[PDB]
């Protein structure tokens, strides 16, 4: 398939960032300038949009137990600047601390982590998932 056909097929699945599409196309042997041109053509035709992509990441990661620090870091790797990341984070209407508490409840139950081993595991899990210090301290009953 042509670079445009390949990129379109990816967008049919989900929103992709310009940087992400470029990387995926280049991974298939497509030359840099040709990959970039395909992405710009799709953006111009209304198929690709980094703003919609960023909002989709915030939404999807939030509902899958990832924290704000993780999401901000991830969006940054897609070449999005501070204002773009802030705008995306602003689309979240939930409570990140509540999401951390929910993840812990789903794993350990209503009583949360009991012994030291479990509390350490809970802290490690929330840190890896990108939650803030306050959220982790609250969820681990620190």
Swiss-Prot record:
GO CC term (a single one): cytoplasm
Gene3D superfamilies referenced in this protein's UniProt entry, alphabetically: Winged helix-like DNA-binding domain superfamily/Winged helix DNA-binding domain (1.10.10.10)
Cellular localisation: Cytoplasm
Predominant cellular place of this UniProt entry's protein: cytoplasm
Keyword Translocase in annotation: no
Any one Gene Ontology BP term: regulation of DNA repair
Keyword terms, alphabetized: Cytoplasm
InterPro entries: RecX_HTH_1st (IPR053926), RecX_HTH_2nd (IPR053924), RecX_HTH_3rd (IPR053925), Regulatory_RecX (IPR003783), WH-like_DNA-bd_sf (IPR036388)
Purpose of the protein: Modulates RecA activity.
Family: Belongs to the RecX family.
Protein name: Regulatory protein RecX
